[PDB]
């Protein structure tokens, strides 16, 4: 409900995305996770989008 | 008048599926249980639901070890 | 979505019908043999609030409002508007 859902978009050339949740009104700094990109087959940084 | 109860749940079907000396093919669930009532022993894995799954097509055998006497589940290899 | 039925709400449950928010002040829920149920609801207008009297049936009634009445601190005036601050979370309000 409160904890809305965001979209971690890959910082590689492709548009693979992970989707997840984040409570924005308590910790509003963006997520800078480092996840596996199955298009590049590498482990590049992901970044929050809507 | 009225009532406030009448609510329960889908019975989870727990307990032991494969008993004592009864050959189990690897990966076969043996005990489906809430916590670690039965602990994993030789050749038997423990899942994320404390379901002790077999790991080697063999027998079963329960025991009691250490200084806590916890039924333990091993796997004789046949 | 927060839909309400008229046999449910007690008092203070803020409802939203006909483009305006309403506070319920009180409601008397009656139903008589060989009739259906109705709740003679003593509402309160919220934007232009004098009073309003609606006698709802048992069905239906209205959606609720985002209607938070929290403590704000008056601290500022400029032209027209009047700014406020929460002493719990420090969010702006105009």
């Amino acid at each position: 409900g409160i904890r809305e859902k965001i979209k971690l978009v890959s910082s590689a050339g492709t548009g693979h995305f992970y989707t997840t949740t984040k409570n924005k009104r308590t910790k509003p700094e963006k997520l800078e996770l480092k996840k596996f990109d199955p298009v590049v087959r590498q482990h590049v940084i992901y970044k929050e989008a809507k | 008048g009225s009532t406030r109860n009448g609510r329960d749940s889908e019975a989870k079907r727990l307990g032991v599926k494969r008993f004592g000396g009864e050959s189990v093919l690897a990966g076969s669930i043996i005990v489906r249980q809430r916590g670690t009532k039965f602990h994993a022993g030789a050749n038997v894995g423990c899942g994320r639901d404390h379901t002790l799954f077999a790991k080697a097509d063999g027998k079963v055998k329960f025991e009691v070890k250490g200084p806590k006497n916890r039924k333990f589940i091993s796997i004789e290899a046949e | 979505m927060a839909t309400y039925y008229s046999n449910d709400f007690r008092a203070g449950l803020k409802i939203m019908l006909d483009g305006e928010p309403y506070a319920v002040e009180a409601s008397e829920f009656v139903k008589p043999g060989k009739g259906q149920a109705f709740a003679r609801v003593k509402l309160r207008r919220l934007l232009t609030g004098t009073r309003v009297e609606k006698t709802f049936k048992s069905t239906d009634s209205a959606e609720g409002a985002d209607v938070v009445d929290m403590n704000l601190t008056y601290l500022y005036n400029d032209g027209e508007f009047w700014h406020f601050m929460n002493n719990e979370t420090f969010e702006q309000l105009s």
């Binding site: 859902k5 989707t19 997840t20 949740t21 | - | -």
Partner: protein
């Protein structure tokens, strides 16, 4: 008159080479982000219609 096919079942099943039927699993159209990717791997390929509800599929599509 010849039997008319239920057209909605025609778009959801397909005959395999020994009489069975294949169907797409039914949980993978929306609220997916609360599902684990273990469920969103096993629901992705095609399934086979079970022995119980196989007679209801044969009756509602006779030509396929």
């Amino acid at each position: 008159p010849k039997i008319k096919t239920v057209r909605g079942a025609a778009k959801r099943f397909k005959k395999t080479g020994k009489g069975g039927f294949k169907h797409k699993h039914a949980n993978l159209r929306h609220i997916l982000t609360k599902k684990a990717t273990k469920r969103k791997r096993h629901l992705r390929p095609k399934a086979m219609v079970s022995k119980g509800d196989l007679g209801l599929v044969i009756a509602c599509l006779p030509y396929a």
